[PDB]
Ligand binder design. Structure first.
Ligand SMILES: Cc1ccc(NC(=O)CN(Cc2ccc(C(=O)NO)cc2)C(=O)c2ccc(N(C)C)cc2)cc1
Ligand SMILES: [K+]
Ligand SMILES: [K+]
Ligand SMILES: [Zn+2]
Length: 356
């Protein structure tokens, strides 16, 4: 069984000053509608949304950050505008806090359904996104780090040392997820992201391949940064073959979370990349070979409504057990992708015998 969570209340968060903002309420409704059109919704077990609690938010976030985001829901528009402007790339409305609580709680209910055996795997069609949010601050359309919180929630309902893999295929680096787990060997973070020598959002050298983790976490942070090329299916498939899957298999996760932005998709106006819906299906199907299939796909970014709807629907089709669609596997890689892959191999060979 595959679970699906979607709740139209998460559409209530919006940019009060721009009706054409990329992080649009219709992102989640279009994805949900496409699941109905492709006859996937009726095949899934519907998992209800719920609110995260403040104690659950404190698994990854500071009390001050929780209280400031909570305080926004009382503010008049002028004060919402001021507060949002204090962060990097954030808009806030009076519904934002509630929507962020529902995004996280939806994912907790999904992780619980997987870990208790009610479903094998699941998809969560949620907003606002999470992976840029830090312990102490909001960033990049994200208020609380839904995927990071879900990893800690999973440990909280099992054992502290439950091995959780987070694969982040959003086109942007999940700076918050990296930082939250940087010293932690129980949560392996693997991000693929457009980097451009630190020029691309979120504009930090923390996203480079030589950031391998700290302390006991050394080797448990895998950054795969792309420079120069318009990356697509062959480059992501090659990164999975040489890096993501060998490392993940050696880590032997007990739960896989996907920070599944669809902003690397063909058609995305921000990402500039060309991963196809069939490409995302192949990435999902590979991850399904891990953790006895216990995979939760969590929406992050993605800004072409057609692209994200087709891409995420293809991922759900794979979770349901459908045959992976045909792909032209032979295609030659862009030259800069091979350079990136080799840089990651050089940085991570000391930590992973599967790369030696
Ligand atoms: C001079 C200058 C200043 C700032 C920037 N900002 C960036 O570099 C990143 N951001 C914001 C952003 C985009 C996507 C994500 C994300 O979470 N993705 O998953 C997270 C954050 C954008 O570029 C952006 C912002 C607004 C847009 N509107 C209203 C059409 C379009 C693009 C660039 C130059
Ligand atoms: K990423
Ligand atoms: K880590
Ligand atoms: Zn993104």
């Amino acid at each position: 069984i595959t679970g699906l969570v979607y709740d139209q209340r998460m559409m209530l968060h919006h940019n009060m000053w721009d009706s054409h903002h990329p992080e649009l309420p219709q992102r989640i409704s279009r994805i949900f509608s496409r699941h109905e059109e492709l006859r996937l919704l009726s095949r899934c077990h519907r998992i209800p949304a719920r609110l995260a609690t403040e104690e659950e938010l404190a698994l990854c976030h500071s009390s001050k950050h929780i209280s400031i985001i909570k305080s926004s829901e009382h503010m008049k528009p002028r004060d919402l505008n001021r507060l949002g402007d204090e962060y990097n790339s954030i808009f806030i409305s009076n519904e934002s806090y509630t929507c962020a609580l529902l995004a996280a709680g939806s994912c907790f209910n999904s992780a619980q359904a997987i870990l208790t055996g009610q479903v094998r795997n699941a998809v969560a069609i949620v907003r606002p996104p999470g992976h840029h949010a830090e312990k102490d601050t909001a960033c990049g359309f994200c208020f609380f780090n839904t995927a990071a919180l879900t990893a800690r929630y999973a440990q909280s309902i099992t054992r502290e040392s439950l091995r959780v893999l987070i694969v982040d295929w959003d086109v942007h680096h999940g700076n918050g997820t990296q930082h939250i787990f940087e010293e932690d060997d129980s949560v392996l973070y693997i991000s693929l992201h457009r980097y451009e020598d630190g020029a691309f959002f979120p504009n930090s050298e923390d996203a480079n391949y030589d950031k391998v983790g700290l302390g006991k976490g050394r080797g448990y942070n895998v950054n795969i940064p792309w420079n120069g090329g318009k990356m697509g299916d062959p480059e992501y498939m090659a990164a999975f073959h040489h890096l993501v899957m060998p490392i993940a298999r050696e880590f032997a996760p007990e739960l896989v979370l996907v920070s599944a932005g669809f902003d690397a998709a063909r058609g995305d106006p921000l990402g500039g990349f060309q991963v196809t819906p069939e490409g995302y299906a192949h990435l999902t199907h590979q991850l399904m070979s891990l953790a006895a299939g216990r995979v939760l796909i969590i929406l992050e970014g993605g800004y072409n409504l057609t692209s994200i709807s087709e891409s995420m629907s293809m991922c759900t089709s794979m979770l349901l057990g459908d045959s992976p669609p045909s792909l032209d596997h032979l295609t030659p890689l862009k030259t800069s992708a091979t350079v990136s892959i080799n840089n990651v191999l050089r940085a991570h060979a000391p930590f992973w015998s599967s790369l030696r």
